[PDB]
PDB file of all heavy atoms in Angstrom:
ATOM      1  N   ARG A  73     -15.754  17.491 -27.200  1.00  0.00           N
ATOM      2  CA  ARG A  73     -17.185  17.396 -27.507  1.00  0.00           C
ATOM      3  C   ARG A  73     -17.778  16.169 -26.825  1.00  0.00           C
ATOM      4  O   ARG A  73     -16.990  15.172 -26.486  1.00  0.00           O
ATOM      5  CB  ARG A  73     -17.447  17.270 -28.983  1.00  0.00           C
ATOM      6  CG  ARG A  73     -16.841  16.098 -29.683  1.00  0.00           C
ATOM      7  CD  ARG A  73     -17.125  16.052 -31.215  1.00  0.00           C
ATOM      8  NE  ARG A  73     -16.544  14.875 -31.866  1.00  0.00           N
ATOM      9  CZ  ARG A  73     -17.100  13.686 -31.988  1.00  0.00           C
ATOM     10  NH1 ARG A  73     -18.346  13.512 -31.446  1.00  0.00           N
ATOM     11  NH2 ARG A  73     -16.563  12.803 -32.570  1.00  0.00           N
ATOM     12  N   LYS A  75     -19.341  12.507 -26.449  1.00  0.00           N
ATOM     13  CA  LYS A  75     -19.507  11.176 -27.173  1.00  0.00           C
ATOM     14  C   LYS A  75     -20.395  10.257 -26.631  1.00  0.00           C
ATOM     15  O   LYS A  75     -20.488   9.109 -27.109  1.00  0.00           O
ATOM     16  CB  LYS A  75     -18.102  10.634 -27.386  1.00  0.00           C
ATOM     17  CG  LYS A  75     -17.451  10.045 -26.078  1.00  0.00           C
ATOM     18  CD  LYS A  75     -16.265   9.399 -26.222  1.00  0.00           C
ATOM     19  CE  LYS A  75     -15.464   8.816 -24.954  1.00  0.00           C
ATOM     20  NZ  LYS A  75     -16.431   7.735 -24.417  1.00  0.00           N
ATOM     21  N   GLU A  78     -23.589   8.105 -20.325  1.00  0.00           N
ATOM     22  CA  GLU A  78     -23.728   6.949 -19.473  1.00  0.00           C
ATOM     23  C   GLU A  78     -24.743   7.187 -18.325  1.00  0.00           C
ATOM     24  O   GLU A  78     -24.310   7.815 -17.334  1.00  0.00           O
ATOM     25  CB  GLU A  78     -22.377   6.527 -18.887  1.00  0.00           C
ATOM     26  CG  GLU A  78     -21.326   6.196 -20.014  1.00  0.00           C
ATOM     27  CD  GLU A  78     -20.026   5.694 -19.390  1.00  0.00           C
ATOM     28  OE1 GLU A  78     -19.739   5.827 -18.249  1.00  0.00           O
ATOM     29  OE2 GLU A  78     -19.153   5.315 -20.194  1.00  0.00           O
ATOM     30  N   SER A  80     -26.740   6.496 -15.086  1.00  0.00           N
ATOM     31  CA  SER A  80     -26.668   5.744 -13.830  1.00  0.00           C
ATOM     32  C   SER A  80     -27.455   6.377 -12.755  1.00  0.00           C
ATOM     33  O   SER A  80     -27.921   7.414 -12.987  1.00  0.00           O
ATOM     34  CB  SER A  80     -25.094   5.602 -13.507  1.00  0.00           C
ATOM     35  OG  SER A  80     -24.883   4.867 -12.346  1.00  0.00           O
ATOM     36  N   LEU A  82     -27.372   7.889  -8.694  1.00  0.00           N
ATOM     37  CA  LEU A  82     -26.434   8.363  -7.728  1.00  0.00           C
ATOM     38  C   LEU A  82     -26.420   7.305  -6.416  1.00  0.00           C
ATOM     39  O   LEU A  82     -27.421   6.950  -6.053  1.00  0.00           O
ATOM     40  CB  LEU A  82     -26.842   9.740  -7.344  1.00  0.00           C
ATOM     41  CG  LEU A  82     -26.551  10.781  -8.364  1.00  0.00           C
ATOM     42  CD1 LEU A  82     -27.181  12.057  -7.839  1.00  0.00           C
ATOM     43  CD2 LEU A  82     -25.038  11.005  -8.758  1.00  0.00           C
ATOM     44  N   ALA A  89     -21.137  13.647  -1.651  1.00  0.00           N
ATOM     45  CA  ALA A  89     -19.938  14.292  -2.084  1.00  0.00           C
ATOM     46  C   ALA A  89     -20.162  15.645  -2.804  1.00  0.00           C
ATOM     47  O   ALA A  89     -19.486  16.550  -2.688  1.00  0.00           O
ATOM     48  CB  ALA A  89     -19.197  13.248  -2.980  1.00  0.00           C
ATOM     49  N   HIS A 139     -24.813  28.891 -10.820  1.00  0.00           N
ATOM     50  CA  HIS A 139     -25.288  27.595 -11.476  1.00  0.00           C
ATOM     51  C   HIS A 139     -26.232  26.897 -10.509  1.00  0.00           C
ATOM     52  O   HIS A 139     -26.856  25.963 -11.098  1.00  0.00           O
ATOM     53  CB  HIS A 139     -24.095  26.841 -12.042  1.00  0.00           C
ATOM     54  CG  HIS A 139     -23.115  27.435 -12.957  1.00  0.00           C
ATOM     55  ND1 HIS A 139     -23.563  27.644 -14.306  1.00  0.00           N
ATOM     56  CD2 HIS A 139     -21.937  27.959 -12.794  1.00  0.00           C
ATOM     57  CE1 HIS A 139     -22.609  28.266 -14.898  1.00  0.00           C
ATOM     58  NE2 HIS A 139     -21.518  28.553 -14.106  1.00  0.00           N
ATOM     59  N   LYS A 390     -38.761  26.916 -28.189  1.00  0.00           N
ATOM     60  CA  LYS A 390     -37.613  27.656 -28.102  1.00  0.00           C
ATOM     61  C   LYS A 390     -38.003  29.127 -28.519  1.00  0.00           C
ATOM     62  O   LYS A 390     -38.814  29.484 -29.280  1.00  0.00           O
ATOM     63  CB  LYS A 390     -36.558  27.097 -29.153  1.00  0.00           C
ATOM     64  CG  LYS A 390     -35.974  25.811 -28.681  1.00  0.00           C
ATOM     65  CD  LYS A 390     -35.288  25.925 -27.514  1.00  0.00           C
ATOM     66  CE  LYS A 390     -34.486  24.566 -27.136  1.00  0.00           C
ATOM     67  NZ  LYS A 390     -33.792  24.519 -26.005  1.00  0.00           N
ATOM     68  N   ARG A 391     -37.166  30.088 -27.915  1.00  0.00           N
ATOM     69  CA  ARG A 391     -37.249  31.490 -28.131  1.00  0.00           C
ATOM     70  C   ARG A 391     -35.974  31.996 -28.781  1.00  0.00           C
ATOM     71  O   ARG A 391     -34.870  31.787 -28.264  1.00  0.00           O
ATOM     72  CB  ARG A 391     -37.557  32.296 -26.706  1.00  0.00           C
ATOM     73  CG  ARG A 391     -37.947  33.642 -26.795  1.00  0.00           C
ATOM     74  CD  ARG A 391     -36.803  34.602 -26.657  1.00  0.00           C
ATOM     75  NE  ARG A 391     -36.046  34.379 -25.425  1.00  0.00           N
ATOM     76  CZ  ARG A 391     -36.338  34.991 -24.376  1.00  0.00           C
ATOM     77  NH1 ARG A 391     -37.327  35.757 -24.303  1.00  0.00           N
ATOM     78  NH2 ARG A 391     -35.556  34.866 -23.259  1.00  0.00           N
TER      79      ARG A 391
ATOM     80  N   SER D 175     -30.418  31.570 -28.979  1.00  0.00           N
ATOM     81  CA  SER D 175     -31.595  31.128 -28.158  1.00  0.00           C
ATOM     82  C   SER D 175     -31.031  30.994 -26.694  1.00  0.00           C
ATOM     83  O   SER D 175     -31.524  31.685 -25.795  1.00  0.00           O
ATOM     84  CB  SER D 175     -32.184  29.896 -28.729  1.00  0.00           C
ATOM     85  OG  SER D 175     -33.318  29.521 -27.804  1.00  0.00           O
ATOM     86  N   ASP D 176     -30.228  30.008 -26.467  1.00  0.00           N
ATOM     87  CA  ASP D 176     -29.747  29.574 -25.184  1.00  0.00           C
ATOM     88  C   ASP D 176     -28.310  29.339 -24.970  1.00  0.00           C
ATOM     89  O   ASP D 176     -28.027  28.315 -24.412  1.00  0.00           O
ATOM     90  CB  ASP D 176     -30.751  28.530 -24.653  1.00  0.00           C
ATOM     91  CG  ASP D 176     -30.740  27.285 -25.425  1.00  0.00           C
ATOM     92  OD1 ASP D 176     -30.184  27.356 -26.595  1.00  0.00           O
ATOM     93  OD2 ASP D 176     -31.403  26.236 -25.275  1.00  0.00           O
ATOM     94  N   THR D 196     -16.433  19.775  -7.470  1.00  0.00           N
ATOM     95  CA  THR D 196     -17.402  19.718  -6.259  1.00  0.00           C
ATOM     96  C   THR D 196     -17.461  18.299  -5.894  1.00  0.00           C
ATOM     97  O   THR D 196     -18.030  17.951  -4.825  1.00  0.00           O
ATOM     98  CB  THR D 196     -18.701  20.480  -6.729  1.00  0.00           C
ATOM     99  OG1 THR D 196     -18.539  21.630  -7.229  1.00  0.00           O
ATOM    100  CG2 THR D 196     -19.601  20.667  -5.383  1.00  0.00           C
ATOM    101  N   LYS D 214     -28.943  22.265 -19.578  1.00  0.00           N
ATOM    102  CA  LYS D 214     -28.545  22.404 -18.170  1.00  0.00           C
ATOM    103  C   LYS D 214     -29.583  22.227 -17.209  1.00  0.00           C
ATOM    104  O   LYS D 214     -29.445  21.564 -16.086  1.00  0.00           O
ATOM    105  CB  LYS D 214     -27.932  23.764 -18.113  1.00  0.00           C
ATOM    106  CG  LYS D 214     -27.141  24.086 -16.752  1.00  0.00           C
ATOM    107  CD  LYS D 214     -27.982  24.922 -15.846  1.00  0.00           C
ATOM    108  CE  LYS D 214     -27.179  25.464 -14.665  1.00  0.00           C
ATOM    109  NZ  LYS D 214     -28.075  26.165 -13.673  1.00  0.00           N
ATOM    110  N   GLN D 218     -29.831  19.186 -14.539  1.00  0.00           N
ATOM    111  CA  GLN D 218     -30.124  19.454 -13.072  1.00  0.00           C
ATOM    112  C   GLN D 218     -31.337  18.817 -12.608  1.00  0.00           C
ATOM    113  O   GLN D 218     -31.488  18.461 -11.446  1.00  0.00           O
ATOM    114  CB  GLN D 218     -29.979  20.957 -12.656  1.00  0.00           C
ATOM    115  CG  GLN D 218     -28.586  21.507 -12.643  1.00  0.00           C
ATOM    116  CD  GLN D 218     -28.445  22.856 -12.197  1.00  0.00           C
ATOM    117  OE1 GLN D 218     -29.363  23.448 -11.814  1.00  0.00           O
ATOM    118  NE2 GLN D 218     -27.216  23.371 -12.068  1.00  0.00           N
ATOM    119  N   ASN D 224     -32.817  10.501  -8.643  1.00  0.00           N
ATOM    120  CA  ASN D 224     -31.764   9.604  -8.710  1.00  0.00           C
ATOM    121  C   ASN D 224     -31.329   9.097  -9.981  1.00  0.00           C
ATOM    122  O   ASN D 224     -31.436   7.951 -10.420  1.00  0.00           O
ATOM    123  CB  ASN D 224     -32.132   8.490  -7.695  1.00  0.00           C
ATOM    124  CG  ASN D 224     -30.945   7.629  -7.342  1.00  0.00           C
ATOM    125  OD1 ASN D 224     -29.746   7.843  -7.664  1.00  0.00           O
ATOM    126  ND2 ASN D 224     -31.047   6.473  -6.440  1.00  0.00           N
ATOM    127  N   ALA D 226     -28.114   9.988 -12.926  1.00  0.00           N
ATOM    128  CA  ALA D 226     -26.889  10.617 -13.099  1.00  0.00           C
ATOM    129  C   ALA D 226     -26.538  10.623 -14.596  1.00  0.00           C
ATOM    130  O   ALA D 226     -25.948   9.711 -15.055  1.00  0.00           O
ATOM    131  CB  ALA D 226     -25.832  10.065 -12.307  1.00  0.00           C
ATOM    132  N   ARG D 230     -19.618  12.072 -21.123  1.00  0.00           N
ATOM    133  CA  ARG D 230     -18.282  11.450 -21.595  1.00  0.00           C
ATOM    134  C   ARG D 230     -17.862  12.271 -22.763  1.00  0.00           C
ATOM    135  O   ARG D 230     -18.499  12.310 -23.729  1.00  0.00           O
ATOM    136  CB  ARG D 230     -18.436   9.905 -21.948  1.00  0.00           C
ATOM    137  CG  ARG D 230     -18.822   9.039 -20.730  1.00  0.00           C
ATOM    138  CD  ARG D 230     -17.604   8.990 -19.810  1.00  0.00           C
ATOM    139  NE  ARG D 230     -17.775   8.099 -18.709  1.00  0.00           N
ATOM    140  CZ  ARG D 230     -18.353   8.546 -17.485  1.00  0.00           C
ATOM    141  NH1 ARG D 230     -18.573   9.788 -17.345  1.00  0.00           N
ATOM    142  NH2 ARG D 230     -18.530   7.684 -16.562  1.00  0.00           N
ATOM    143  N   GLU D 232     -14.654  13.588 -25.556  1.00  0.00           N
ATOM    144  CA  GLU D 232     -13.637  13.259 -26.252  1.00  0.00           C
ATOM    145  C   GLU D 232     -13.165  14.469 -27.141  1.00  0.00           C
ATOM    146  O   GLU D 232     -13.995  15.356 -27.535  1.00  0.00           O
ATOM    147  CB  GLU D 232     -13.888  12.021 -27.257  1.00  0.00           C
ATOM    148  CG  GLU D 232     -14.851  12.235 -28.416  1.00  0.00           C
ATOM    149  CD  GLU D 232     -15.008  11.046 -29.204  1.00  0.00           C
ATOM    150  OE1 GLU D 232     -14.479  10.072 -29.040  1.00  0.00           O
ATOM    151  OE2 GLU D 232     -15.911  11.257 -30.150  1.00  0.00           O
TER     152      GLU D 232
END
Side-chain angles (χ1 to χ4, degrees):
Chain A
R73 66 177 178 87
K75 71 177 178 67
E78 293 184 354
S80 177
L82 291 173
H139 300 286
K390 296 291 184 181
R391 191 265 303 274
Chain D
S175 178
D176 53 356
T196 315
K214 186 259 187 181
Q218 287 185 355
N224 196 359
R230 292 291 182 267
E232 66 180 1

